[PDB]
Ligand SMILES: *[C@@H](O)[C@H](CCCC)NC(=O)[C@H](CC(C)C)NC(=O)OCc1ccccc1
Ligand SMILES: *[C@@H](O)[C@H](CCCC)NC(=O)[C@H](CC(C)C)NC(=O)OCc1ccccc1
Ligand SMILES: [Cl-]
Ligand SMILES: [Cl-]
Ligand SMILES: [Cl-]
Ligand SMILES: [Cl-]
Ligand SMILES: [Cl-]
């Protein structure tokens with residue numbers, strides 16, 4: 001596998017978005033993974049609607065601004081037959097009545113693939129051969145809220161008790177040695193003013209740090 | 222006109238490039254504008270060759286790594302009958318022999334449209350209705366070099382004596398009021414590591430700040 005991967009360089013990733021005061025991280029992780037797979041299939045990078053996911057996927061078990069899961073989002077897209085563009089269905093960061101229109105759909109999926117739980121080498125393989133991957137992580141620490149640069153490593157991080165969905169867009173290493181200071185390249189949904197212009201490097205191959213490989217998945221397009 | 226526009230979210234913009242040690246900003250601004258118009262016309266996003274413009278547009282009045290102008294680059298593409306892909310004519314950040322190959326051409330233009338000098342409302346209309354727009358600006362400040370986040374506003378900026386070509390990919394505002402804290406969304410060519418993932422927000426409707434609306438143009442495809 002490559003020593004480094006960054007899907008941003010290949011046209012798979014939309015700009016950093018901001019969920020604002022709504023617990024919709026799962027919808028942003030899901031649209032980021034679907035954006036990547038739809039681009040891999042058609043060559044067109046089109047921002048997808050998190051608001052469509054927040055408003056319309058309660059039947060699949062999501063709870064809008066009160067939380068949800070990327071897999072349930074991919075299930076909704078499948079049961080629904082489509083997902084609207086962000087342009088047609090804008091994000092307002094609150095729970096609202098479903099406004100989905102098939103005429104505005106720009107994406108579809110047949111379900112999703114799960115990466116082997118807890119296996120960082122399985123995740124590395126999926127990132128290198130599929131594109132961006134939705135993952136869950138433990139973001140419940142002030143060190144993450146205030147993160148700025150470098151490789152994120154939090155001693156109190158859990159790999160089991162996760163509370164935030166994000167998008168792995170690559171991996172790499174700091175310094176000249178490929179096996180030293182490895183990291184996962186993660187796109188957050190807290191705007192570009194958070195972290196390193198909206199991104200964070202999370203320690204890689206350090207015992208599934210913060211649970212990045214515990215519950216990873218991607219849509220099948 | 223829309224309250225905000227972001228052509229990156231619609232597939233019109235290639236990933237951020239890096240001119241390195243060559244004064245070829247004008248060529249990157251020109252390829253970015255043609256990449257957007259060729260995508261609007263065909264639905265295919267193809268990276269274009271800045272190196273073809275650097276090496277071949279001296280007859281039109283450009284000077285390669287010593288500087289140039291987007292309008293002269295669109296004139297070269299028109300007179301030349303085409304422009305090659307980045308893949309077929311790679312960027313090497315130095316003045317080299319013209320190696321234009323018609324069989325590798327993936328873009329054409331019949332000339333260009335200019336935006337009336339100094340008219341930010343005319344620039345806003347062009348961005349909303351056409352796609353990304355080539356523009357000149359005053360980038361000669363340490364504040365721009367070390368720019369990292371927020372709306373860029375530099376007191377020492379000129380709206381008349383400009384030195385750097387960039388690409389306006391959209392516009393927006395901060396918060397709920399669409400008329401307050403407005404900005405131009407600008408793609409630079411100093412690599413993704415510069416600024417905010419290679420982008421900068423420049424103050425909009427603040428007296429043509431840094432000259433963004435002084436010499437704007439786009440190719441006619
Ligand atoms: C991130 O913005 C949110 C914050 C939720 C605060 C209330 N986190 C989630 O949505 C999280 C993401 C997974 C760990 C990937 N899931 C979650 O909180 O789900 C809650 C839930 C429980 C049962 C049924 C539906 C949702
Ligand atoms: C940006 O990389 C370059 C830096 C040039 C350093 C020498 N800027 C330009 O090319 C600039 C862009 C315009 C303002 C849009 N143009 C410029 O410097 O042109 C110089 C020139 C004069 C006469 C004939 C050709 C070129
Ligand atoms: Cl971004
Ligand atoms: Cl999930
Ligand atoms: Cl490794
Ligand atoms: Cl010009
Ligand atoms: Cl002309």
Ligand SMILES: [Cl-]
Pocket residue numbers: 400403426
């Ligand atoms: Cl306005």
